[PDB]
Design a protein around this ligand. Structure first.
Ligand code: GSH
Ligand code: GSH
Lengths: 215, 215
């Protein structure tokens, strides 16, 4: 049974959790609490990891880091990355465009100047969301009729960005509607209501935005 | 004949250029000069691009953005991404670990506080480089005997990081040796000596680090 190691936060790994749950995949978690950085520094080089980091995925022999390699791998095992170069690259484009939002948040969230940097990010964010709103015009999910992993990436980014600004989706009905549709997927619905859902923090606990024990 | 659009800078796209040259691939470039931001704002939505950005790749019907989707696509056309989920994920791990360095630089390079932020990045950088030095112990390239696209990604990151600190490879002989080996690849050697090589800037021209018309 594979292992997903990460902090007990949403952060980089939350979209991978959602995808594991959507595929009804078994996995145990190594969850590093806020006060358990020492427990991590003590396992870091003892896991057989060639690029030691968090998150890590361990599928006995397959010993993986980098959250994007991990999410893509799980999708790969279920044959969900694309059937030719073209489709594979559209998925990788969806992927990276979502990351522009999610990393956009992460890159300012630990800054002393978070509050002012917030203004410049929320100015840009409508252009970014519009690309996704247009893609979902006549298209149920990001890649058509079936879920792919960038759907869960997008879901995660909308969730996070709605804490930063509760009104940032009011111009984007198809995006509001996408977020609900992911929530209605029976597997996802059971997970978000379960003991395993980590509601908070969005970021590391020490962050100006999305940190702390509670919202 | 496909088109690679980008600023006339190294930036996000330089590793893709290197890979196109290694594969002896034909491509014309759209190169946005420093003073040509208006020329770009005027083509941005007229290219058939669903997530308009720079870089973009256009392979007639295939209309792509996001530099990581683009680099991976070109490699895909040459069957270089991996033959099973396992190998595909190792490549994606190599990829992302290199990006930790390259984005690590980009994320501070435009900051007012660049010079102090530089200190904290160069403190971390030896741990990051050590993972690559260890991987290249008994292994010619990052993935064994053959070049894969993360090799050119690593090359780009070493080049950039050596401007930040000319001595940052003095503890890492196998990495110094990797950088030279890429330079000795006949295709790469011809490109770096050619009119097409864009030596500078490393970043956008407005950057504190790696900017300006000249080094
Ligand atoms: N690009 C990497 C980023 C790795 C990273 O910045 N990891 C953070 C977690 S948010 C960490 O605290 N890692 C522990 C460590 O560096 O030892 C990824 O996608 O996994
Ligand atoms: N994650 C994206 C980043 C896109 C990006 O930040 N592009 C910069 C170039 S360094 C830009 O000036 N794009 C022009 C625009 O946003 O209209 C990628 O890898 O292509």
């Amino acid at each position: 049974s594979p292992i997903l190691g990460y902090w007990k936060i949403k952060g980089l790994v939350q979209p991978t959790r959602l995808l594991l749950e959507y595929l009804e995949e078994k996995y145990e978690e190594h969850l590093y609490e806020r006060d358990e950085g020492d427990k991590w520094r003590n396992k870091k080089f003892e896991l057989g990891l060639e690029f030691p980091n968090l998150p890590y995925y361990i599928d006995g022999d397959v010993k993986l880091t980098q959250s994007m390699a991990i999410i893509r791998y799980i999708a790969d095992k279920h044959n969900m990355l694309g059937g030719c170069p073209k489709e594979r690259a559209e998925i990788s484009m969806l992927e990276g465009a979502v990351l522009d939002i999610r990393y956009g948040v992460s890159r300012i969230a630990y800054s002393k100047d978070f509050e002012t940097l917030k203004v410049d990010f929320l100015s840009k964010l409508p252009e970014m969301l519009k690309m996704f709103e247009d893609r979902l015009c006549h298209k149920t999910y990001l890649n058509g009729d079936h879920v792919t992993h960038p759907d869960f990436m997008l879901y995660d980014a909308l969730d996070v960005v709605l804490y930063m600004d509760p009104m940032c989706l009011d111009a984007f009905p198809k995006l509001v509607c996408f977020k609900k549709r992911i929530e209605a997927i029976p597997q996802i619905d059971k997970y978000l209501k379960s003991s395993k859902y980590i509601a908070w923090p969005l970021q590391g606990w020490q962050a100006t935005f999305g940190g702390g024990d509670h919202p």
